[PDB]
Amino acid sequence: DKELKIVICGGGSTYTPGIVKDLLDQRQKINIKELWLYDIDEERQNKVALIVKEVIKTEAPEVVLKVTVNPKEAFTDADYIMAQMRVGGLKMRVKDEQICLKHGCVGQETCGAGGMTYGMRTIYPMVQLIDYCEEYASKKYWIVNYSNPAAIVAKATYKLRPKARIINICDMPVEIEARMAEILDCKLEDIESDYFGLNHYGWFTHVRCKGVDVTDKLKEHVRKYGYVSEASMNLLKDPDWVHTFKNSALISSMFTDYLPNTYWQYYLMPDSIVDYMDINNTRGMQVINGREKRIFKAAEDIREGKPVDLQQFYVGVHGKFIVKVVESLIHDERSRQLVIVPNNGAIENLSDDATVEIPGYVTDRGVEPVRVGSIPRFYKGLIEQQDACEGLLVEAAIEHSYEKALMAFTMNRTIPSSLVAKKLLDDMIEANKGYWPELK
Amino acid sequence: DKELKIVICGGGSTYTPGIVKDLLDQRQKINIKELWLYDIDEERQNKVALIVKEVIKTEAPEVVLKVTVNPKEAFTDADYIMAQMRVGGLKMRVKDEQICLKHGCVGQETCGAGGMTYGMRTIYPMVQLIDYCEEYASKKYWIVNYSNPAAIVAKATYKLRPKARIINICDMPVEIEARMAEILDCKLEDIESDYFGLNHYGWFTHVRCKGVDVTDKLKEHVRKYGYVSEASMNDALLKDPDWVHTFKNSALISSMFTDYLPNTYWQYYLMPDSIVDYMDINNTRGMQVINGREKRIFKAAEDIREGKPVDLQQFYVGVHGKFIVKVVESLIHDERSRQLVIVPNNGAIENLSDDATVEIPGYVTDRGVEPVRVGSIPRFYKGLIEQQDACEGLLVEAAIEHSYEKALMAFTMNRTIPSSLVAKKLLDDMIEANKGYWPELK
Amino acid sequence: DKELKIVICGGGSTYTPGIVKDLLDQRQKINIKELWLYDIDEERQNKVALIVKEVIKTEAPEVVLKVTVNPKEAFTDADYIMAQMRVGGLKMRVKDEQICLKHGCVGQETCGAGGMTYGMRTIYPMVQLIDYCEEYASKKYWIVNYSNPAAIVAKATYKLRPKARIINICDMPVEIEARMAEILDCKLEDIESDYFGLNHYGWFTHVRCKGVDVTDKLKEHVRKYGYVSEATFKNSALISSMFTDYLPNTYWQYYLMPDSIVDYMDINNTRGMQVINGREKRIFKAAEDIREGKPVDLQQFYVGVHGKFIVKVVESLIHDERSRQLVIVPNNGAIENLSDDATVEIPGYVTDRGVEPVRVGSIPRFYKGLIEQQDACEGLLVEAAIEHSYEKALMAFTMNRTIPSSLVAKKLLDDMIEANKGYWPELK
Amino acid sequence: KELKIVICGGGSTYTPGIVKDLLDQRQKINIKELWLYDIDEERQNKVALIVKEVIKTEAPEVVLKVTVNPKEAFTDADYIMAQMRVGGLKMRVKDEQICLKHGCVGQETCGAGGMTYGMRTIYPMVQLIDYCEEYASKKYWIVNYSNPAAIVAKATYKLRPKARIINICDMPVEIEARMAEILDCKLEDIESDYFGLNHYGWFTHVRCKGVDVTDKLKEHVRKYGYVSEASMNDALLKDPDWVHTFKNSALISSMFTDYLPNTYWQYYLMPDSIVDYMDINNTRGMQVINGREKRIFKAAEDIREGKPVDLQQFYVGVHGKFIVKVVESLIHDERSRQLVIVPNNGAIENLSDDATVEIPGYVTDRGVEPVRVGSIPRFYKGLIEQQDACEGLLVEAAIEHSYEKALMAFTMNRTIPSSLVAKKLLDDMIEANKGYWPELK
Ligand SMILES: NC(=O)c1ccc[n+]([C@@H]2O[C@H](COP(=O)([O-])OP(=O)(O)OC[C@H]3O[C@@H](n4cnc5c(N)ncnc54)[C@H](O)[C@@H]3O)[C@@H](O)[C@H]2O)c1
Ligand SMILES: NC(=O)c1ccc[n+]([C@@H]2O[C@H](COP(=O)([O-])OP(=O)(O)OC[C@H]3O[C@@H](n4cnc5c(N)ncnc54)[C@H](O)[C@@H]3O)[C@@H](O)[C@H]2O)c1
Ligand SMILES: NC(=O)c1ccc[n+]([C@@H]2O[C@H](COP(=O)([O-])OP(=O)(O)OC[C@H]3O[C@@H](n4cnc5c(N)ncnc54)[C@H](O)[C@@H]3O)[C@@H](O)[C@H]2O)c1
Ligand SMILES: NC(=O)c1ccc[n+]([C@@H]2O[C@H](COP(=O)([O-])OP(=O)(O)OC[C@H]3O[C@@H](n4cnc5c(N)ncnc54)[C@H](O)[C@@H]3O)[C@@H](O)[C@H]2O)c1
Ligand SMILES: O=P(O)(O)OC[C@H]1O[C@H](O)[C@H](O)[C@@H](O)[C@@H]1O
Ligand SMILES: O=P(O)(O)OC[C@H]1O[C@H](O)[C@H](O)[C@@H](O)[C@@H]1O
Ligand SMILES: O=P(O)(O)OC[C@H]1O[C@H](O)[C@H](O)[C@@H](O)[C@@H]1O
Ligand SMILES: [Mn+2]
Ligand SMILES: [Mn+2]
Ligand SMILES: [Mn+2]
Ligand SMILES: [Mn+2]
Structure with missing residues (x-):
């Protein structure tokens, strides 16, 4: 019932425009105060944010958009943080898939040696996302993480940060x-x-x-x-x-x-x-x-x-x-x-x-x-x-x-x-x- | 969508007129085909049925009430069975409490020696209620059991009849x-x-x-x-x-x-x-x-x-x-x-x-x-x-x-x-x- | 084999003369270099020690007896420490049993409130005996503890000192x-x-x-x-x-x-x-x-x-x-x-x-x-x-x-x- | 006390070895009779020949008995040493041949070869247990050392939990x-x-x-x-x-x-x-x-x-x-x-x-x-x-x-x-x- 600060961790993602519109499709139930786009790649997020600015224009022009690469700005008083990061990007993904197929093993994003390699790239950056919200975000924040590998990240984040308000x-x-x-x-x-x-x-x-x-x-x-x-x-x-x-x-x-x-x-x-x-x-x-x-x-x-x-x-x-x-x-x-x-x-x-x-x-x-x-x-x-x-x-x-x-x-x-x-x-x-x- | 046959196992209970009215207050959500009062004591149930008819006459006169002591007639095609039996009645309850106090122990309905004694009276009669519904009632029946001692009877019914559709x-x-x-x-x-x-x-x-x-x-x-x-x-x-x-x-x-x-x-x-x-x-x-x-x-x-x-x-x-x-x-x-x-x-x-x-x-x-x-x-x-x-x-x-x-x-x-x-x-x-x-x- | 340093943790105990003789009977298998008596009541230990040396010279007058209260003295290079302490002594056991009977409960040394009360006295003194041997005694020492309440002591010492070489x-x-x-x-x-x-x-x-x-x-x-x-x-x-x-x-x-x-x-x-x-x-x-x-x-x-x-x-x-x-x-x-x-x-x-x-x-x-x-x-x-x-x-x-x-x-x-x-x- | 010793699988290649090592402890194992049981009659008697000369050179006072009848071999049996290889030493070859035909390891006890060998020995082992519970001494012991010991021990415990087997x-x-x-x-x-x-x-x-x-x-x-x-x-x-x-x-x-x-x-x-x-x-x-x-x-x-x-x-x-x-x-x-x-x-x-x-x-x-x-x-x-x-x-x-x-x-x-x-x-x-x-x- 309170104005909420929705933060997208990984704003430069390819799924960001589709996530925003589905979030704007539930406006009468989610009281959006500020829609924040956070990322570590500034010039990549700026290009994807232009589509989000058009998704907002075509669906709900009253929604205020914010784009930043500073974690203090993005996560201060953050109520809900939908995490969708890809550490290393798709360029590192094909490197995991090429090395696996070079040795005759399967090369997948989340399964096999490729997913295990993608996992250890996302373990500590995810924990850093946890510590960002514990410091700056709302005391009752929530991290709805769907970034892969979900099996390795959820196991790592639970052993490292058991008290994290995460799903x-x-x-x-x-x-x-x-x-x-x-x-x-x-x-x-x-x-x-x-x-x-x-x-x-x-x-x-x-x-x-x-x-x-x-x-x-x-x-x-x-x-x-x-x-x-x-x-x-x-x-x-x-x-x-x-x-x-x-x-x-x-x-x-x-x-x-x-x-x-x-x-x-x-x-x-x-x-x-x-x-x-x-x-x-x-x-x-x-x-x-x-x-x-x-x-x-x-x-x-x-x-x-x-x-x-x-x-x-x-x-x-x-x-x-x-x-x-x-x-x-x-x-x-x-x-x-x-x-x-x-x-x-x-x-x-x-x-x-x-x-x-x-x-x-x-x-x-x-x-x-x-x-x-x-x-x-x-x-x-x-x-x-x-x-x-x-x-x-x-x-x-x-x-x-x-x-x-x-x-x-x-x-x-x-x-x-x-x-x-x-x-x-x-x-x-x-x-x-x-x-x-x-x-x- | 389907008319339901509700059976109150133990219609001669002091709580029977209460739950009948509480069931009639949800008439739009619960489509009651018939209301059945089943008991092993015929004379005690017939006196309580007089009040149930008066409750039906006051809150919802369109609900037909059937009273019986025959389990096959009571549990045939039964959709929901609400058990509220007291094996031995209140007569055996005061004897359990008196025997405990005679030995300087807590004489309670469901706690202590009085509860364990009340529990062993209810184990097999509850199992017989389960077998009635497995044999006569609908294949999607439900027994919402709230008869005491709920702790002992639930552990007993789960061990003997693990497949029973009981809560x-x-x-x-x-x-x-x-x-x-x-x-x-x-x-x-x-x-x-x-x-x-x-x-x-x-x-x-x-x-x-x-x-x-x-x-x-x-x-x-x-x-x-x-x-x-x-x-x-x-x-x-x-x-x-x-x-x-x-x-x-x-x-x-x-x-x-x-x-x-x-x-x-x-x-x-x-x-x-x-x-x-x-x-x-x-x-x-x-x-x-x-x-x-x-x-x-x-x-x-x-x-x-x-x-x-x-x-x-x-x-x-x-x-x-x-x-x-x-x-x-x-x-x-x-x-x-x-x-x-x-x-x-x-x-x-x-x-x-x-x-x-x-x-x-x-x-x-x-x-x-x-x-x-x-x-x-x-x-x-x-x-x-x-x-x-x-x-x-x-x-x-x-x-x-x-x-x-x-x-x-x-x-x-x-x-x-x-x-x-x-x-x-x-x-x-x-x-x-x-x-x-x-x-x-x- | 090796001449061992046997230490009795609680030399002022009423059982010490019995443990000493039973240990002297197996002298052909236990190579004793010096028998030690450790305690915190030097007045009580010295009187019981008079019975020990008389037991020694009537059974095996060639083993060396030592009576000390310095913890570093008794447990330095110690190979085996046999604990039989009673924290509070027999003068507090009578009070544990009187308090239980004050309320109509079981007044026993190890069972009931008398045992729990006794156990709460022996926990940390036992932990200190462990930390005494971990630094002063031999690195392969063994503490054979039989001092009551063994049930409360063993559970407390295992959680507090999991790596304790205790039995x-x-x-x-x-x-x-x-x-x-x-x-x-x-x-x-x-x-x-x-x-x-x-x-x-x-x-x-x-x-x-x-x-x-x-x-x-x-x-x-x-x-x-x-x-x-x-x-x-x-x-x-x-x-x-x-x-x-x-x-x-x-x-x-x-x-x-x-x-x-x-x-x-x-x-x-x-x-x-x-x-x-x-x-x-x-x-x-x-x-x-x-x-x-x-x-x-x-x-x-x-x-x-x-x-x-x-x-x-x-x-x-x-x-x-x-x-x-x-x-x-x-x-x-x-x-x-x-x-x-x-x-x-x-x-x-x-x-x-x-x-x-x-x-x-x-x-x-x-x-x-x-x-x-x-x-x-x-x-x-x-x-x-x-x-x-x-x-x-x-x-x-x-x-x-x-x-x-x-x-x-x-x-x-x-x-x-x-x-x-x-x-x-x-x-x- | 005198003990009836039974070797389950006398035609095995290890029969002369375990008999020698059993006769070395003749002072610690009072051997009443030594029994060689098997289902292959022709194979066991040939191996029994070596057992006859092993006992001759070591302790010629031990009574040797060969048979293929389970009632003869297991009645009043005090200790039975399991040593069977059902299917024989040539079904073992086809286990290691089929595995290598699919590019997999062909082992007696590991891989698909060992799992196949296990499925052959499960029910024969259950029958050996039921033979002893019915015929053998009330305090019999089956010292089972026949492979696949992993699958057999798991199958024999789930099927015969109260079996006196080791x-x-x-x-x-x-x-x-x-x-x-x-x-x-x-x-x-x-x-x-x-x-x-x-x-x-x-x-x-x-x-x-x-x-x-x-x-x-x-x-x-x-x-x-x-x-x-x-x-x-x-x-x-x-x-x-x-x-x-x-x-x-x-x-x-x-x-x-x-x-x-x-x-x-x-x-x-x-x-x-x-x-x-x-x-x-x-x-x-x-x-x-x-x-x-x-x-x-x-x-x-x-x-x-x-x-x-x-x-x-x-x-x-x-x-x-x-x-x-x-x-x-x-x-x-x-x-x-x-x-x-x-x-x-x-x-x-x-x-x-x-x-x-x-x-x-x-x-x-x-x-x-x-x-x-x-x-x-x-x-x-x-x-x-x-x-x-x-x-x-x-x-x-x-x-x-x-x-x-x-x-x-x-x-x-x-x-x-x-x-x-x-x-x-x-x-x-x-x-x-x-x-x-x-x-x-
Ligand atoms: N679990 C699922 O069902 C499911 C489904 C779809 C996508 N996903 C996940 O979505 C994520 C994004 O997929 P994509 O194709 O859009 O990837 P992408 O590479 O196109 O974009 C990922 C974005 O994350 C940013 N990023 C990287 N590390 C970051 C960090 N530490 N903090 C913040 N932002 C960071 C990148 O800079 C980039 O903007 C991946 O992790 C993917 O596995 C999961
Ligand atoms: N779960 C709870 O917290 C809770 C609360 C209230 C009542 N209850 C239980 O409700 C039950 C009824 O209480 P009450 O004071 O109204 O009892 P009551 O003695 O007034 O009536 C109990 C009825 O059960 C009948 N009965 C006895 N054995 C039977 C059997 N084998 N099959 C069918 N009917 C049988 C009796 O003839 C009688 O009509 C008791 O078991 C009581 O403990 C439980
Ligand atoms: N577990 C068993 O089978 C078994 C059998 C008999 C006795 N016990 C127990 O063994 C102990 C034998 O002693 P007792 O009953 O002869 O009593 P006791 O009072 O005669 O002797 C106990 C001794 O422990 C000493 N002591 C006290 N605190 C000490 C500490 N922190 N460090 C070292 N020594 C300390 C005392 O000064 C005293 O000399 C008692 O606890 C007794 O209940 C156990
Ligand atoms: N410690 C170990 O795990 C260990 C060591 C050595 C050998 N083994 C096992 O010893 C067994 C024998 O090896 P081997 O090379 O001497 O075998 P082998 O083929 O030479 O002899 C096996 C014998 O078992 C007999 N037999 C078959 N089915 C039987 C049955 N139902 N009852 C009784 N006898 C039966 C056969 O007729 C044959 O004489 C094998 O199972 C082998 O894996 C295991
Ligand atoms: O029949 P009474 O002694 O008044 O008991 C009244 C009832 O109170 C609650 O509902 C308890 O859950 C029952 O176990 C108890 O029977
Ligand atoms: O102290 P007593 O009453 O003689 O008890 C005899 C001894 O035997 C008991 O089994 C306990 O192990 C000791 O704590 C006790 O001291
Ligand atoms: O390969 P083989 O000569 O038949 O020997 C195989 C045997 O050797 C090993 O040492 C194991 O102890 C046995 O379980 C195994 O069956
Ligand atoms: Mn997924
Ligand atoms: Mn209750
Ligand atoms: Mn004791
Ligand atoms: Mn083996």
């Missing part, structure tokens, strides 16, 4: 039930699923469209066509997410207990992913020539006074799900979202420091995670491997240990051998000088 | 929240608290009115006056002098242990000395409700049969009916209401065993309860729950395995019982007084 | 094993039992003499005459009859039947006064008769399997003999249904590097609930020592079974604070 | 033999702390006569591995594979510097180096056909003709002595501290209860008393948890007759790089093990 979320589960809703002619607001596992490492146990269970109806379709549908093709315009949503067919057919997350293709079938990818045109290269080009081109058109199509960025359930989390934090709406919380008994046969991705009711005081219970053996063993992998990686950043990171690389299902882990690790240390913590 | 609740925390509403001059709708422990064995960690945390302000008042305010005296529950003494005893407990606001029933566990002296062997609490709540509900039955006018607002008091109807209503429309229910732990409270039936906040869905991950509790409250959970656990094993030694272990474990020697003299006294109600113990 | 034992399980052997006509060295629980809070699950299990024959006799045989003890016949699974520890007569003990105890003549005018007075009169040249009987102190059990643990630490004993150890999964920081009393193999406890497994519900209550009771009392909290000490008093209510617990704790000023830590 | 393995003792040869220490004075699964553990501390030598061993093993100069003289180092396995541990000990690794970690941590090293037309299972199995059938033919046999070629290795010491400890209650396989149940706190871990324990006359070792670090918890789930899912596939549980188990295994490869390996193992594997719907 780590991901939209990949929301994107899957967006596909699941179209398979059934169901509307996305009427969908709801039970879920467990780590980030990019979970399963849909039960699905229901408006209270009526559905899991069997979806299981039959996904095992035959995957998460694609005849209406899905109308994000599905991207020729790479059509491969991911289709790849869920073989996984859901071999293991028939639950409906799988699309990120299981990189762990269950890494040999097929390696042959599918191309080191000369990695996914990061595909978005530099795609999403990032179309947002720089739109910034140049605004400078040239030419009309821009602002609906390029108003796509996906990405922005809608994040604003709902903020909206539930403001009015205590008790929204049930698949968020990432410390376990501490939520899943009994898992460790306490494990950051599981489970359903929880978003209160104004934080997430109230639902007690899930015990999980089967096949899913405990997979999570125990990744949880130890992520845990050894965090401990490598805390202790500045080379062996701890080497142990974490060997633990990953992507890395096939202890010898490959050492050769992959030594290449990342060379390519992350100035980003990674120094290992001894 | 065990209690109004004692809600009644405490009503007092906290009066102390703060806050509306009960705006109240919400964090809570953990067992039934009649819990603690309020945080309490907030309209989202604003008011725990520190409440414990300031409770430490000096207890759960009693000057506006609390105006309501109907605080008319009973036993409830005034019961709420005002929380001042000592909230002053010695300053972490949380205690549940009211800690009066008998933490202070059995001050309770054995306060109670009267010749006028126990069960005797008081016989000369009070039970007397005034069978008087109104005779007044109805004599044409004299009956004051129906006698039984419309308390948050008893309002809380139980809200649970069923949240089961029908999937309202996701956050209530303090009794669920199997299974990691909800990490320091406790899996089969511990803890009383924690949960969201009532049309599929059951989704309990929130409470986490770890400090040492002083773990050790207290570990003792009672072992006590209640050994008592459930005594009913299943028919073991006399497990029952002696259950009585020895309880905090009310001072020694194992008193536990045997009390147990053997309960064996004879409950011949016909208890399971055989070899 | 907490108790002869009460061995004394029961002695009376068991007398029932079965068995040699004490041939008896061996499986055991679990807290110190003075455990049970005998299986007992065997010469390999043959004799549990059923024992509990037949113990249910009739208790642990007493034809060749406190007799009270265990009721406990073994009401609960038929295991053979109980004798100390369960205070927790399972507290009010029955209160009717048996006389406040004007407590147990601590029986030893004042009994064991303690026979030690000082013996030292008095030694000072006057009167011939003394040194065999009156040689009684008991008390000293022989503690020497056996030390000998097993020296030569790595793998002696299986009932030792108080940190749980950490030895009993699954108990917390990690629970100090369980389970059989373990005494090695040259410490005790290797056997994995016991899960215990049934009735014994878990009783242990969980006492473990939380002792855990809260230890937290009251570290955090200096009056509410934590009140919580621990309320948790104890022998306390009828929290009302009596507050009146009981307040009386203990009045009588233990100078021994207890501050409680805000 | 699962052991000489691999830690074979390493302890090598460690003793590096430090000029005697094997009787060696003693080590150890945790993990069977062929999946780590040596945390090592002592020679009670003095820690772990840092001194790490200095040598990180350079030459478990290979030393005195080790070469031993008969096991004359095999070219057992030298490559003991020197391969140099890298694993150099990368993970916490503990000394079990030599079987080369198959889990290095599936690239092993598949490159293995020859598909001459696997380890083939090297024992024309190697160990040829030297024992040569000796069996030498006896029936009259030619005197050299029996000391079967009298090498810590395998037999370590097994006889365990059974001797059960008879006289010697409390021998051995590295055995027991149900966890809190022994390793941060592991599941049904996990069968390999930890030190004191062998009494009533079973093994394992020591409480506590929690293990994160890197070693995650590795064991993955293998524990792998072996757990494989045991469930045997009990529940589920094809999906088997596919889940083959996918969890570290040596299998993909679910696609896990499905292709499982389908080939099903066809090759028809009649040995249970049905998988």
